[PDB]
Amino acid sequence: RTELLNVCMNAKHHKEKPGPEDKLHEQCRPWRKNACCSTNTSQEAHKDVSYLYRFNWNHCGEMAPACKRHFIQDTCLYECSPNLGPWIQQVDQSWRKERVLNVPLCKEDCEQWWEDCRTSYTCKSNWHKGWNWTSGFNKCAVGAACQPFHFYFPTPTVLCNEIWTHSYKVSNYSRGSGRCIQMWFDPAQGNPNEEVARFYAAAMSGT
Ligand SMILES: Nc1nc2[nH]c(CCNc3ccc(C(=O)N[C@@H](CCC(=O)O)C(=O)O)cc3)cc2c(=O)[nH]1
16 A cells, blocks of 8 residues: 555445546535545435445434434545545455544534434444344344433544444544544535645655
8 A cells, every 4th residue: 555645445335446426426426526436336325224235324213314414424435535545454354355444533523423413313332343134234232222322422532433443533633624534525615635635644654
């Protein structure tokens, strides 16, 4: 891994290389200029128990729209961003050779994500391992474990870090500091992650 900019990780769905995709679905739209995902990938992002991972958001009763939308953006960011290089690593599992680890999510993105989920419900604090997939999609391990979302994710930083086994590492930096990744941004104002990736690829450069 010598070049960490304008590159796609090697997971279950990514393309080999970044590239224009003017047909991306609704929330994935800000990556139409340069994406790692396909029209279909972005399309399944937005759906319940998707073709992507058969993942069930409504494992603890219906998940509130205001919350689910954040998960859809995350999915977009993970499946579409070309600027995640500096945090790519190898792990070698049955469904992805590579993945991202300790992405410095902008303080607010995390807080807002945390905030919008207050009303929703979950049963696990780790959404990568532990689900009963018998049914065809992930169901609750201990069916009676269903608690308020903030019960398993007490603070924002807990949510963003632990829910995806440390794919994020919530930065102290705020949106626009040039030092953290935004999973929400206005494409009309340009892709702010492009400068963030470039910065961090230099701070860890050489050996
Ligand atoms: N930011 C960010 N978002 C992300 N979204 C996703 C999507 C990832 N969803 C899935 C989570 C769990 C499963 C699953 O079958 N688990 C098994 C064990 C999984 C395994 O080790 O083989 C279990 O329950 O025991 C499938 C998809 C990743 C991911 C990520 O890495 N980062």
